[PDB]
Nucleic acid binder design. Structure first.
Lengths: 82, 205, 80, 85
RNA sequence: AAUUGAAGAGUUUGAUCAUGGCUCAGAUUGAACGCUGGCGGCAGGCCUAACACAUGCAAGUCGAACGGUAACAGGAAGAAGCUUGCUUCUUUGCUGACGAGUGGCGGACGGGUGAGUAAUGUCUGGGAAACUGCCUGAUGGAGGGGGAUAACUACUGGAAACGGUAGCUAAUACCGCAUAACGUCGCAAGACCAAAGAGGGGGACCUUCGGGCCUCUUGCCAUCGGAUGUGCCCAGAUGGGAUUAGCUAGUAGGUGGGGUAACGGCUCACCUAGGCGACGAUCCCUAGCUGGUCUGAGAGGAUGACCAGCCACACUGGAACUGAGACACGGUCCAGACUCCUACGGGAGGCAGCAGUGGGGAAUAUUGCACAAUGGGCGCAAGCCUGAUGCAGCCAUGCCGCGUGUAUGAAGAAGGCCUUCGGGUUGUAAAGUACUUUCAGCGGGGAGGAAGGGAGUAAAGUUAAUACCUUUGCUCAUUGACGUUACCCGCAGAAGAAGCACCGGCUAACUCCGUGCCAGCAGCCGCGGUAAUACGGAGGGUGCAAGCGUUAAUCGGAAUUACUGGGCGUAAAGCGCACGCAGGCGGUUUGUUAAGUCAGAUGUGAAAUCCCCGGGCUCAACCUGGGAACUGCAUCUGAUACUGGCAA
């Protein structure tokens, strides 16, 4: 199974999640096929907080990739524009 | 992490007024300047080339109240920035928040300005900044909070702001007690007697 | 097309096979001098037409024995 | 060691026994075939080949011989009989 | 916009210039030690014994696969104290559920360590002869039977570990039978090959009135694709030693048989007599490799702790079994060393998972909290498990930030030290006076990491059905280990908060006293044999600063291995002289090629890191968005001056 999932990369008490496409049996912050966006749960209240490449996500779900609950929640957040 | 000692001693080893006790009175009058930085201070040094470079770096740090690892980091940042490394180094020392509070006349010295900055009496852009070395960007408004406004110090400090030369890159205005750092100071806009090529060459050996 | 190499036969005497020296001409990494450098390869030929001292083109295929992953395409320049 | 590894131990023993029996019957049928090819017998070996074909395809489908091996056998043995017949 | 980048000095001499070594000034570190030590943020923390391990956790899950009931809580029925209205006890898996068992899936991931391995490894680029559970797309099938076996019961062996015998039962366990392709074999003709059900709900009909039947969801099987993962091959590159020059008989190749998922001496029989090697084979010493890190102006040199990719190992040596995948860290078997239990017959174990011990060492941490987040396994889901992970504890180990106040203050106080006894210096220093409260302390307020999940609706889809299920909105309670959180406000008062090295030259910073070739110092030069700016103390100063020194190690300086970038008459250095093979280099003109060379394009050069322009933490360290870069390799397209090939 390949999974589009989050991978924790920020500092302590300040996570920055990068949404990647990994073979699901790798580690979380390990090996991935391609990274496809990010998700900062803070970032500030400025402009984005999250961008996420929907074309490549649709490509991988076309291939057979699964999606975790957060990535599904983010696609349900950034629906097409908002 | 800061000096905490006899100040006019530091101003007396350098041979030059480092503005370390600006305060109430005029030119020193009780310093014995030039005469004796210690017991054998009456001796002329016959200073070396390392001694003149070193002594120039110490002049600049002892003016702006910076220690060595922090100064050295300013030299690395001034080196990597595009342009002239001496002028970039003075631009990094002049954007310090305690310095900008001193230039605006809010503190009598840079240590008093550093205590105003330190004791949460200073906002930049409507946010309180507690840090002596905050790097003030151009077109910023740095002011005093409602607490520690109309305290004696700052008033007296603005009283001795008119005795100095009114820096060109500021909007000093003392009515509202707020200032605007408008642009970066040109090298020709500050002090004229520090030799920054000596401290470039000091760190480049 | 296919990727192929050219080289010369260095020895002959084996039962439907041959061995070919390849001359790559590579710059030294430190010194900047272009130096000749060989690559001997055990090469297969059905019915062993090429003899010693030839020049032959050669392509890569599946393994046919130990080392031997190379097979000729065209024997040129056999002149003794 | 104290786990669900005990269950995998006992299951792998049980499946070892089952697979050993089926693997042994498969190998005996193939020995029937190219032990009939040892003598110059065409139709006897064809009868043995027809006797081994469903069991080798079947053990390929059941999952213990991994069908390419299945194919090899029948391929090799077909060659032997048309080396002979 | 993405390379703004290069320092010397001391010491050979009576002096000189050159050569030349030694040494110092810098940056760095998984550091240790000595003295000192306030706070915070972010990181890091057994480098040695791949030594031995007490104890606790680190891999379980599913009853929506199955027989079933060991508990827990209900339900039905019976009997009793009977307060005729509530308790007590009993039979029933009847139900929510569930110990043990069968079965499916996972225990091959995650996590550890660097022993071995110098090339069955790694890096970069090509390739063909492959397998691929879960995930996805398409085409179809999913019919009909059988024999068992756990659990259970009864005996029974054994000290235990663990068994044995006889009966009973189920399944998505196992086995046939039918069915058969765009599947396997075969040139074809033909031959042959599989499967498994379960759950939610329901109008009518049929009920042996249990349920058939309809619908939905999910699962099964076969084939072809896809994605991911893995196996295999080639070329180049990736330590030191020639005081290691010969190595190799399954060895090199061929034919045929076997074997593997797949090519292949992978294996065997036969035939040939090869193969590798001075472009360094073989042997020996060392070593995990890389992205990177440190240093450097650069080219290089050293290194490969954290983080990430690959490999290898799991007490030691070997082997396979199960499985999509292992020759398997918390599996099996054997053997060995050690440790333990024993009734002496035999058994048991494996921290290089996380904590932790003992030992070793100059040296390196808690037997913590939580699954709230992110991820993983199982499950339809709820949820269960997770020493991954998130966090917390200890440690100045590093980086970064802040603090120990601020202004005024000459009687230039006292006291110390020096003094040519005039004074000088400590020194605006302190005290005095006037202000400020960062951080620590005390008391209130209080984000964010929280998205989902659950329970009701409404609509749509499906359908016979306004059920059930799926999706989308809406409403209602909720879900934080950290955590007395970050941060904000108020309180009291400068109140709780400065050391360490050095002062002869290099090298910033000087006098007095004690000692008298002693005591001792020292990186080099060298000081000390009575007025020592070098020893020990004091005053004074200098440099750094919650650090500072010493030691170890690397690069620099070192152009002292010189590719960039050195030399050889006399400083070290021209073979005693020639001939000459391999090697290196090659006059001149024209034509062709285009291998080197150059230009462009494409694929790749993982992400992080370095660099540039921005963004967020009050700033910084830190985190992060986009680019540049990765100087390379391969292929294609061109150019043809130079070099090479070929012809004249």
């Amino acid at each position: 199974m390949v999974t589009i999932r989050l991978a924790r990369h920020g500092a302590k008490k300040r996570p920055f999640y990068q949404v990647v496409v990994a073979d699901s049996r790798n580690a979380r912050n390990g090996r991935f096929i391609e990274r496809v966006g990010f998700f900062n749960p803070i970032a500030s209240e400025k402009e984005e907080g999250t961008r996420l490449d929907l074309d490549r996500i649709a490509h991988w779900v076309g291939q057979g990739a699964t999606i975790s609950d957060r990535v599904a929640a983010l696609i349900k957040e950034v629906n097409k524009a908002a | 992490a800061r000096y905490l000692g006899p100040k006019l001693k530091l101003s007396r080893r350098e041979g030059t007024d480092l503005f370390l006790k600006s305060g109430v009175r005029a030119i020193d009058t009780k310093c014995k300047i030039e005469q004796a930085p210690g017991q054998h201070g009456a001796r002329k040094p016959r200073l070396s080339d390392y001694g003149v470079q070193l002594r120039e770096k110490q002049k600049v740090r002892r003016i702006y109240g910076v220690l060595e690892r922090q100064f050295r980091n300013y030299y690395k940042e001034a080196a990597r920035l595009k342009g002239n490394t001496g002028e970039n180094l003075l631009a990094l020392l002049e954007g310090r928040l305690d310095n900008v509070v001193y230039r605006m006349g809010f503190g009598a010295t840079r240590a008093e300005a550093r205590q105003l900055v330190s004791h949460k009496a200073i906002m930049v852009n409507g946010r309180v900044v507690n840090i002596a070395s905050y790097q003030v960007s151009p077109n910023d408004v740095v002011s005093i909070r409602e607490k520690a406004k109309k305290q004696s110090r700052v008033k007296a400090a603005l009283e001795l702001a008119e005795q100095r030369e009114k820096p060109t890159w500021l909007e000093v205005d003392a009515g509202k007690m707020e200032g605007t750092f408008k642009r970066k100071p040109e090298r020709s806009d500050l002090s004229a007697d520090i030799n920054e090529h000596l401290i470039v060459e000091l760190y480049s050996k | 097309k296919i990727r192929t190499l050219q080289g010369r036969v260095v020895s002959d005497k084996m039962e439907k096979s041959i061995v070919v020296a390849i001359e790559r001409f590579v710059k030294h990494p430190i010194y900047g001098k272009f130096i000749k450098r060989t690559t001997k390869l055990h090469v297969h030929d059905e019915n062993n037409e090429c003899g010693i001292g030839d020049v032959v083109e050669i392509r890569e295929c599946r393994p046919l024995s130990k080392t031997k992953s190379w097979t000729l395409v065209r024997v040129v320049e056999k002149a003794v | 060691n104290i786990k669900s590894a005990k269950k995998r131990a006992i299951q792998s023993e049980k499946a070892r026994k089952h697979n050993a029996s089926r693997r042994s019957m498969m190998r005996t049928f193939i020995k029937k075939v190219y032990a009939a090819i040892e003598a110059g017998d065409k139709a006897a070996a064809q009868k043995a080949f027809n006797e081994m074909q469903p069991i080798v395809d079947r053990q390929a489908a059941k999952g213990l011989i991994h069908k390419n091996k299945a194919a090899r056998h029948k391929a090799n043995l077909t060659a032997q009989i048309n080396k002979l017949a």
